[PDB]
Amino acid sequence: AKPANKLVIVTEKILLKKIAKIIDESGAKGYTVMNTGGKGSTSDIEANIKFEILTETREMAEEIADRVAVKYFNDYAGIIYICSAEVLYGHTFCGPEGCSAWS
Amino acid sequence: AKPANKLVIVTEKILLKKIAKIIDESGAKGYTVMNTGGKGSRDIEANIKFEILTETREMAEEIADRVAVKYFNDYAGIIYICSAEVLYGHTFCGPEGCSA
Amino acid sequence: AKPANKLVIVTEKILLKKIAKIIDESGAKGYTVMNTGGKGSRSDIEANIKFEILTETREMAEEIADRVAVKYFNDYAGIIYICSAEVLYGHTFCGPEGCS
Ligand SMILES: Nc1ncnc2c1ncn2[C@@H]1O[C@@H]2COP(=O)(O)O[C@H]3[C@@H](O)[C@H](n4cnc5c(N)ncnc54)O[C@@H]3COP(=O)(O)O[C@H]2[C@H]1O
Numbered sequence: 001a002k003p004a005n006k007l008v009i010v011t012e013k014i015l016l017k018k019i020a021k022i023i024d025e026s027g028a029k030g031y032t033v034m035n036t037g038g039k040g041s042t043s044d045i046e047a048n049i050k051f052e053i054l055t056e057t058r059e060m061a062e063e064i065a066d067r068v069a070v071k072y073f074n075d076y077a078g079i080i081y082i083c084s085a086e087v088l089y090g091h092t093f094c095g096p097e098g099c100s101a102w103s
Numbered sequence: 104a105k106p107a108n109k110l111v112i113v114t115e116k117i118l119l120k121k122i123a124k125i126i127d128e129s130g131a132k133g134y135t136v137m138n139t140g141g142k143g144s145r146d147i148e149a150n151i152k153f154e155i156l157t158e159t160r161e162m163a164e165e166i167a168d169r170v171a172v173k174y175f176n177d178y179a180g181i182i183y184i185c186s187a188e189v190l191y192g193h194t195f196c197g198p199e200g201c202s203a
Numbered sequence: 204a205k206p207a208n209k210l211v212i213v214t215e216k217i218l219l220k221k222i223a224k225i226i227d228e229s230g231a232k233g234y235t236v237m238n239t240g241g242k243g244s245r246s247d248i249e250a251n252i253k254f255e256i257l258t259e260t261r262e263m264a265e266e267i268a269d270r271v272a273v274k275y276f277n278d279y280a281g282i283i284y285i286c287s288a289e290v291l292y293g294h295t296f297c298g299p300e301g302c303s
């Protein structure tokens with residue numbers, strides 16, 4: 001198992017490509033994105049998107065978060081949070097030695 | 104980074120508005136909801152997943168308790184909680200920001 | 204609250220039924236699946252799938268992960284990771300005595 005930070009970004013759908021570009025410029029090895037509905041305090045739910053990015057370091061997750069927020073969160077609704085995770089399998093994330101290599 | 108409990112509610116799609124109403128009455132700052140599936144009690148049956156970030160464990164438990172008592176003896180559902188830290192979130196962290 | 208491991212499997216949509224079968228054979232008490240995207244090997248977004256499975260033990264989650272990866276991950280793209288969670292309500296996960 002390889003330690004990882006799971007960075008979650010929930011924001012307005014129109015920022016999809018802009019945020020993907022930031023994630024791709026970060027060094028991150030991938031991301032997953034999904035459609036969601038969002039309410040923040042006539043249905044009032046709006047369409048949003050949620051990105052999930054697993055990063056090897058906490059610093060990379062914060063860089064992505066910081067860059068997204070500083071660029072867009074003055075003007076667009078969003079939330080960014082982080083969860084601890086462990087990657088058990090992931091050719092790209094762990095490399096070809098796998099996620100439980102020794103040393 | 105502000106500690107948060109991430110409360111997840113997975114249940115029947117027909118309960119969407121009813122659960123949202125509970126989350127809106129709770130003081131929670133917001134929620135996300137998505138369409139998901141599972142095999143269904145009966146190939147994949149559509150259901151829904153709510154994610155609510157709460158500042159306290161007690162708020163997450165109050166929501167969970169309310170939803171579960173009101174609906175989960177009559178409808179299928181699971182509620183669980185994960186630890187998260189919010190880095191950014193104007194509404195969640197307030198104007199003081201997430202140094203909380 | 205009952206401790207749980209949340210196993211997450213993100214992989215190619217064509218594997219949906221095959222991975223479900225492995226989860227069903229594992230002893231796991233359920234799963235949720237959703238439609239997601241990633242950038243794709245080729246810009247814009249390629250459809251894929253995400254499974255979330257809550258397991259009572261860490262070893263059951265790893266058994267599922269090991270069976271999926273060995274069987275499919277030399278030939279199909281995927282990532283499997285695990286988060287700690289606590290189940291607050293879940294008739295199937297916790298049994299009729301409740302999550303405590
Ligand atoms: N351990 C777990 N990990 C991740 N997600 C979980 C889970 N337990 C439940 N879920 C999610 O919550 C929904 C309601 O599940 P519940 O167990 O109340 O109600 C279930 C249960 O009564 C029965 N069922 C499904 N799978 C089962 C299994 N493996 N063992 C026993 N009963 C199952 O079918 C009903 C509807 O299930 P469906 O999968 O459509 O819908 C599920 C699924 O999306």
Ligand SMILES: Nc1ncnc2c1ncn2[C@@H]1O[C@@H]2COP(=O)(O)O[C@H]3[C@@H](O)[C@H](n4cnc5c(N)ncnc54)O[C@@H]3COP(=O)(O)O[C@H]2[C@H]1O
Binds near residue numbers: 029092093213244245
């Ligand atoms: N930044 C990058 N660097 C190198 N190669 C890249 C890449 N982004 C995409 N790829 C390549 O394309 C495949 C499919 O990626 P996609 O984003 O569609 O779909 C991904 C994605 O939704 C999810 N995933 C992968 N890594 C992730 C991460 N670090 N965080 C969150 N989700 C991830 O797992 C699916 C299968 O991923 P997998 O890595 O097996 O396989 C990847 C990988 O071989």
